[PDB]
Design a protein around this nucleic acid. Structure first.
Ligand SMILES: [Mg+2]
Ligand SMILES: [Mg+2]
Ligand SMILES: [Mg+2]
Ligand SMILES: [Mg+2]
Ligand SMILES: [Mg+2]
Ligand SMILES: [Mg+2]
Ligand SMILES: [Mg+2]
Ligand SMILES: [Mg+2]
Ligand SMILES: [Mg+2]
Ligand SMILES: [Mg+2]
Ligand SMILES: [Mg+2]
Ligand SMILES: [Mg+2]
Ligand SMILES: [Mg+2]
Ligand SMILES: [Mg+2]
Ligand SMILES: [Mg+2]
Ligand SMILES: [Mg+2]
Ligand SMILES: [Mg+2]
Ligand SMILES: [Mg+2]
Ligand SMILES: [Mg+2]
Ligand SMILES: [Mg+2]
Ligand SMILES: [Mg+2]
Ligand SMILES: [Mg+2]
Ligand SMILES: [Mg+2]
Ligand SMILES: [Mg+2]
Ligand SMILES: [Mg+2]
Ligand SMILES: [Mg+2]
Ligand SMILES: [Mg+2]
Ligand SMILES: [Mg+2]
Ligand SMILES: [Mg+2]
Ligand SMILES: [Mg+2]
Ligand SMILES: [Mg+2]
Ligand SMILES: [Mg+2]
Ligand SMILES: [Mg+2]
Ligand SMILES: [Mg+2]
Ligand SMILES: [Mg+2]
Ligand SMILES: [Mg+2]
Ligand SMILES: [Mg+2]
Ligand SMILES: [Mg+2]
Lengths: 127, 111, 51, 167, 185
RNA sequence: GGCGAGAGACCGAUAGCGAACAAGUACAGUGAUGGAAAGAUGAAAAGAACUUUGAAAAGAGAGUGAAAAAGUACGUGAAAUUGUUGAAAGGGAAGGGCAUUUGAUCAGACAUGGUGUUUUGUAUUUCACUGGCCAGCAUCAGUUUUGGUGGCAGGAUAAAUCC
RNA sequence: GGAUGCUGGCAUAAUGGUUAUAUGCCGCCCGUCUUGAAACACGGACCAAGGAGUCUAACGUCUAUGCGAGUGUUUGGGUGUA
RNA sequence: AUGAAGAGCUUUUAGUGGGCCAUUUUUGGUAAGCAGAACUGGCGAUGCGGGAUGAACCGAACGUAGAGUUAAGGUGCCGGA
RNA sequence: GGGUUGAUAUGAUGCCCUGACGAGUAGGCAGGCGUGGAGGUCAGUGACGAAGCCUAGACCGUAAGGUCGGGUCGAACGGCC
RNA sequence: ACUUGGCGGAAAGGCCUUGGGUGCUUGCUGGCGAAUUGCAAUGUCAUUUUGCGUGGGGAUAAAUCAUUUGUAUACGACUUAG
């Protein structure tokens, strides 16, 4: 159902991890640039981690697209969902985390009626 | 630099394979005679061949033709440089200087 | 959108040069020369062969 | 609202492809493949078997036969890049091969529901095989040891250097 | 690599898209960039560039300046264009019947120009009256008349208004300003 | 400052007055002086009757409670650090980067409009295919690599050989 | 003035992602002063939380806005849903 | 002659004001990986391939990737040839 | 450096075309991410379970970070200007 | 697969040989069969170990702790005994 798109290319599927997030627990994995005068990572010696830069950017045709080819749009109710009535081949709905189980039923029913794809049609389902 | 005296064959091959003009400060592939007629038709030049002619038979408008021509972006020689060591003179067994008529071979390997 | 190289792609060759059609028709890349009966003087040869 | 909106939505109308300039014109088979030539099959069920080349079909394939009475290879369709053409030659003048085409070999594709638990032949194909092979063995019987050469299977030995070999 | 002759990735150094967030000025820009794009007239480009300018590069233009400009030869029946504001000037006692196109008019300037029989015009009505700049006369105001320019280039033997809050005797009128006290600059 | 009032784009228990609590308290110092830490069960104690093992603390059950993954060491209950289980590796460190194997684990698309009634609930439907992953062949284009081969020119119109 | 056609298999953990491990090659500890740090130079055993160019008076250049030879209501008064 | 990659102009402000190395010129000194100057180029501020190893030497300067060709240096094995 | 307001549809800071370029300490500038609170709005989420916490489970983004699923939890909390 | 007689100790664990049995023999001539794995997909053929089963044979122990000894000994260990 998705709109035709090219092969999706990423150029770096590996998460850029902070230097020594593997060595110290106080050092979190969220990327920080090394600003040190003698940093091997800042100086880009062979054999060190890679630094994020703009050349790794994704093609503007395939940016923000999930592997299904849809752009994700968060919804909390049927009125927010109905904005994607005429955009089913481009945008897929994601029900927000804080939505209740009984309202997820309504959102999923209306999305099935309108032909809208839902990325998480299994949250808070009992059986 | 390495320099010498080029032949019609290598001039023609260069202008046809790596032929780029300076149009409004841009590097335009020639690919057609209309560009040349528009940017050099002032100076009697209509075709890539008349351009090659103004080059080889060094004419009144060589300056304007050669300035229109963007610098040729050549690859490295496909067979190599021939010597083991480049930065001696062509006479002393190197590559730089005037290799009067041996420049055609090098340029054809580089183009 | 793409630089097609003459010296291959006869179509682009002919787009740039219409003379390329008759160049091949007459085989001007293999033109024969008029024979000549010129012989150098004795001074040239003896100076060349001189020690 | 959890996510506000995009102010512009892309169009869902699909764009049409440009007119392509890639015409279909026929194959230029290599000069070693002539009808009647003996081929060695390199891949497939019948890999290593020697076989006869009869006809160049429309879908860039070769029509091929053992003959079936000799080595067990029936009237079949193979690809030129998966065979070696030998210098050995047979005369096929006298085989009415015009009947065969791409439609003669049609698989009658399988449906989604038919899943094989654990695990037939067309009499037309059987009879056409018996018709062609009888005209082929009549000519193979002339040259000596050729029926045996075809019944045998090809194999590379220790020392065989295919860049040096001749087939 | 490249042995670069110039500085790479350098901005032109010229303003585009005026950084004023005024929507009416943005609309004037939308109109005049279209006209500069399609009319082949240099007037449109001049006005478009002038609409980008800052306040100090858009000084006010006095009606007396306009009167000078119309006292030129062949300029009496012309349309004066001020990309900026027009201010009044009581130092004149006559004003002609001209038409004046400008962004803003002060109340006094508008009243003078109207009382003289003229009309005060906007740059959008100028666009329909003169899309290529027919019979126009662009006036710019004085830029170096500012106070900040007095101090630009301060140094010995330039004569360039030191930066000083309180003036009078005993504020920078001593050593360095008279031979009796050391030296004079 | 004292008494009495009303407010806040203030702080929110390592903050905010030192002090949200028996705080100028406990405590230290001969003394002048110095000066903390410390809030939260639950709506309600309904704060665990009773059985059993044990010297007892406690435990195991049972029971109260919406919840004992709320038991007065009580809201939530992070990390360091530790125990048990499971998984994997390990010849003087470990850890990291590129790449793939092996193992484990996992998302996505597989309906599609469509001839169509071989149709039941008579109009729901009867429905062959449709689009995704991986390849192969042919004909082309762009960039390049490696070969075979033909026609020409030049030189002492090769020098030689040969006569 | 940029690849189309034909065919086959699968339609699933098969491709692929993540993760651990193995293998080949590379890979010195961060921060800091310093011409020069992996340093036999200094700090750092670990973890959580806290933790460092702020506000003001007067100014300068630039920018934006309002009016414009004028400009600044808010010391104060009037009024008020204070 | 060649080239111009836009030319000219102004305002304001940061950091810096310990330097070091190589070729060549050169002063003191027996000399110094010493001290001090001149010209350029570099390190500092710079990773990459090579020089086994190295701030400066050779080559070459870096967005992310693919293919090809090469520089310097190399092709017994370690090690691609 | 240029093109493109034309009516009908969505974004003129938009879309599109063309060419070139991309090292970087101190330092400068720009565009963005995230936190506590304030005004406005989504008649936003929520005991049919908010926030927080754990999660070699998944998705988006160059990244800052954002989103989802599962577990735990119990009373509030977010998106956009 | 049996069977006879030898030789081989450097890590022999293999080499040679006798007798008959049995199977194949492409040395030669014939007959029948193969197909559909659909135009290729290693298109699965090897050896390494371990375990659980059936059925046919084969054999029916030691060490350590504890005690003890002092030719030994920080403790382990060692040496003795029962
Ligand atoms: Mg960490
Ligand atoms: Mg450094
Ligand atoms: Mg090569
Ligand atoms: Mg070399
Ligand atoms: Mg292009
Ligand atoms: Mg570059
Ligand atoms: Mg609870
Ligand atoms: Mg609780
Ligand atoms: Mg608790
Ligand atoms: Mg822990
Ligand atoms: Mg090709
Ligand atoms: Mg080729
Ligand atoms: Mg010749
Ligand atoms: Mg996998
Ligand atoms: Mg894989
Ligand atoms: Mg894996
Ligand atoms: Mg690992
Ligand atoms: Mg190493
Ligand atoms: Mg020092
Ligand atoms: Mg040291
Ligand atoms: Mg010390
Ligand atoms: Mg110190
Ligand atoms: Mg220490
Ligand atoms: Mg903190
Ligand atoms: Mg006044
Ligand atoms: Mg007053
Ligand atoms: Mg300064
Ligand atoms: Mg200074
Ligand atoms: Mg420094
Ligand atoms: Mg360097
Ligand atoms: Mg050099
Ligand atoms: Mg490469
Ligand atoms: Mg090698
Ligand atoms: Mg532009
Ligand atoms: Mg910096
Ligand atoms: Mg929750
Ligand atoms: Mg974890
Ligand atoms: Mg509560």
């Amino acid at each position: 159902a998705s709109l035709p798109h090219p092969k999706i290319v990423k150029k770096h599927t590996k998460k850029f991890k902070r230097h020594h997030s593997d060595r110290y627990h106080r050092v979190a994995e969220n990327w920080r640039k090394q600003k040190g005068i003698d940093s091997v990572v800042r100086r880009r010696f062979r054999g060190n981690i890679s630094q994020p830069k703009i050349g790794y950017g994704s093609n503007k045709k395939t940016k923000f697209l999930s592997p299904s080819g849809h752009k994700t749009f968060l919804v909390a109710n049927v009125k927010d969902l109905e904005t994607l009535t005429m955009h089913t081949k481009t945008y897929a709905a994601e029900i927000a985390h804080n939505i209740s189980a009984k309202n997820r039923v309504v959102i999923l029913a209306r999305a099935k009626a309108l032909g809208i794809k839902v990325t998480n049609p299994k949250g808070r389902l009992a059986l | 630099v390495a320099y010498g005296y080029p032949s019609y064959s290598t001039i023609r091959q260069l202008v046809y394979k790596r032929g780029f003009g300076k149009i409004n400060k841009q590097r335009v592939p020639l690919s057609d005679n209309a560009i040349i007629e528009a940017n050099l038709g002032k100076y009697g030049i209509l075709s890539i061949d008349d351009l090659i002619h103004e080059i080889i038979t060094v004419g009144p408008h060589f300056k304007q033709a050669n300035n229109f021509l963007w610098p040729f972006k050549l690859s490295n020689p496909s067979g190599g440089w021939g010597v083991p060591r480049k930065f001696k003179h062509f006479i002393q067994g190197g590559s730089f200087g005037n290799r009067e008529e041996f420049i055609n071979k090098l340029v054809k390997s580089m183009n | 959108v793409l630089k097609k190289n003459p010296l291959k792609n006869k179509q682009v060759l002919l787009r740039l040069n219409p003379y390329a059609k008759v160049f091949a028709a007459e085989k001007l890349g293999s033109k024969k020369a008029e024979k000549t009966g010129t012989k150098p003087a004795a001074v040239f040869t003896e100076t060349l062969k001189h020690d | 609202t959890a996510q506000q909106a995009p102010k512009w939505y892309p169009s869902e109308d699909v764009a049409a492809p440009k007119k392509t300039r890639k015409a279909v014109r026929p194959q230029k088979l290599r000069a070693s493949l002539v009808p009647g030539t003996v081929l060695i099959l390199l891949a497939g069920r019948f890999r290593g078997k020697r076989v006869v080349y009869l006809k160049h079909l429309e879908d860039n394939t070769l029509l091929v036969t053992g003959p079936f009475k000799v080595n067990g290879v029936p009237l079949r369709r193979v690809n030129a890049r998966y065979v070696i053409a030998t210098s050995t030659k047979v005369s096929v003048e006298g085989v009415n091969v015009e009947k065969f085409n791409v439609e003669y070999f049609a698989k009658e594709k399988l449906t989604k529901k038919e899943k094989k638990e654990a695990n037939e032949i067309k009499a037309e194909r059987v009879e056409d095989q018996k018709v062609v092979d009888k005209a082929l063995i009549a000519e193979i019987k002339k040259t000596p040891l050729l029926k045996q050469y075809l019944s045998a299977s090809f194999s590379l030995k220790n020392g065989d250097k295919p860049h040096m070999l001749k087939f | 690599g490249i042995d670069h002759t110039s500085k790479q990735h350098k901005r032109s150094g010229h303003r585009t898209a005026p950084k004023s967030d005024n929507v009416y000025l943005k609309l004037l820009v939308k109109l005049y960039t279209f006209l500069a794009r399609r009319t082949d007239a240099p007037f449109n480009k001049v006005v478009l560039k002038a609409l980008f300018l800052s306040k100090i590069n858009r000084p006010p233009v006095s009606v007396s300046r306009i009167a000078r400009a119309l006292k030129q030869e062949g300029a009496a029946n012309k349309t004066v264009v001020v990309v900026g504001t027009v201010t009044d000037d009581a130092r004149i006692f006559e004003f002609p019947k001209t038409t004046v196109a400008a962004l803003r008019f002060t109340a006094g300037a508008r009243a003078k120009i109207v009382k003289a029989g003229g009309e005060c015009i906007t740059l959008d009505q100028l666009a329909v009256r003169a899309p290529k700049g027919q019979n126009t006369l662009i006036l710019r105001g004085p830029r170096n008349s500012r106070e900040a320019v007095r101090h630009f280039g301060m140094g010995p033997h330039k004569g360039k208004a030191p930066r000083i809050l309180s003036t009078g005797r005993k504020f920078e009128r001593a050593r360095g300003r008279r031979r009796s006290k050391g030296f004079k600059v």
